[PDB]
Design a protein around this ligand. Structure first.
Ligand code: FN9
Ligand code: FN9
Lengths: 215, 215
């Protein structure tokens, strides 16, 4: 048949996080295990009342990892903050806590976003893929992460000082912009015409000095 | 073979909007059409270097529709202002302009979010399905749109006044909240513990007065 009540520490009735077809993740109850095909799928009833039948890399434990289980390449779910709102989104651990990053984790989310995060804002995916980047759906992000992880600890970055004037790419074009803050391996950029800010990785090829170091 | 060059008014080298795997939409160029089986798929090079072969309900025109073409149920793409950046996301027209909503379109986005927007924030999807909601991926949201569109002009809603105290739902829990503001078919809710604000449709069972009437 194929009706398990256990699979390792994945035990029906447990509480768990699950990835919804919106790409955000939500708490739920694991109500079933079904072998289908070569492997197993985990059925989540969400506290927000939907249901999904999910592969093991689209569920996560509802506890925070022990730092010192996480390493570069770890597949995680992490907290993103819209200000007051909090959301849960998948990503990759690009750095672990050190002195120069103020003992935080650098997360590269599957939509290309990047941010520093605490141990209490993380959740370990339950059954990640051997090559953990291989379930990143945006091809351009998967590739940046495969390159990054495979080259690590090689990590080219341009240096930047507050105030510095550079061009930063966005939606295919280059924009007059300004370096308005440095935090570790991230830099905050002000797009001038339009007044947006965002945090960008300093090894990112959207920064012109880094685009031009490399070509 | 099946290598047309102009399907309807879709024509190679035109500017178009395309849906990425992030679910967010982005500008590129239509670089080919391909017959596949019953119909055709449309290949898009994005300004941000990605390439995608896309069904015709996942591309939108780069122009704003004429109001009066939009009926309730129209499959559109709409601007979403996430703090300081602007994003493009898909949805369904819930309401067309009138007095009460102050000549705006109510948009039900594919992720369950609701908001009012102008004609200049909308883009028509090139080739929507007959039943326009069937390419909504989250089942909970698809079910609601379908019910909504089908019951229309029926539109149950609760009356809420500013300062009212009600419990509102979020991630399976009911929360102490306050009504801050009423905009047409929407209410802005303060979640008193978290200090969050959300805009919520007044026909949402997340609103405990709706949760009880509907029961
Ligand atoms: C991790 N993501 C980040 C997205 N926000 C973002 N992405 C990128 C990529 C590159 N940049 C510069 C940025 C950026 O500046 N922002 C703000 C929002 C997304 C989300 C949020 C709520 C609901 C569903 C999806 C979660
Ligand atoms: C249309 N979406 C809305 C999401 N924001 C939102 N969704 C819901 C649903 C229900 N509620 C109450 C809310 C809510 O309050 N917010 C703020 C953000 C999402 C996005 C943004 C950037 C990148 C990728 C995706 C676009």
């Amino acid at each position: 048949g194929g009706e398990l009540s256990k699979d390792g520490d994945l035990i029906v009735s447990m509480r768990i996080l699950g990835k919804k077809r919106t790409k955000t993740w939500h708490k739920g109850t694991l109500i079933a295990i079904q072998t289908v095909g070569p492997g197993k799928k985990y059925k989540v009833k969400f506290d927000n009342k939907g249901k999904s039948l999910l592969s093991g890399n689209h569920i996560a434990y509802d506890y925070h990892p022990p730092a010192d289980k996480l390493y570069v390449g770890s597949r995680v779910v992490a907290k993103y903050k819209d200000g007051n709102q909090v959301w849960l989104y998948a990503g990759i651990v690009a750095e672990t806590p050190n002195v120069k990053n103020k003992l935080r984790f650098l997360i590269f989310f599957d939509d290309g976003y990047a941010s520093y995060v605490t141990q209490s804002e993380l959740y370990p995916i339950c059954r990640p893929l051997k090559k953990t980047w291989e379930d990143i759906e945006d091809i351009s992000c998967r590739d940046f992460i495969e390159e990054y992880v495979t080259a690590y600890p090689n990590r080219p970055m341009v240096l930047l000082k507050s105030g510095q004037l550079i061009k930063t790419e966005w939606e295919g074009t280059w924009w007059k912009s300004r370096v308005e803050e440095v935090d570790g391996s991230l830099v905050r950029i002000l797009f001038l015409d339009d007044k947006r800010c965002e945090w960008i990785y300093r090894g990112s090829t959207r920064l012109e000095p880094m685009f031009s170091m490399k070509t």
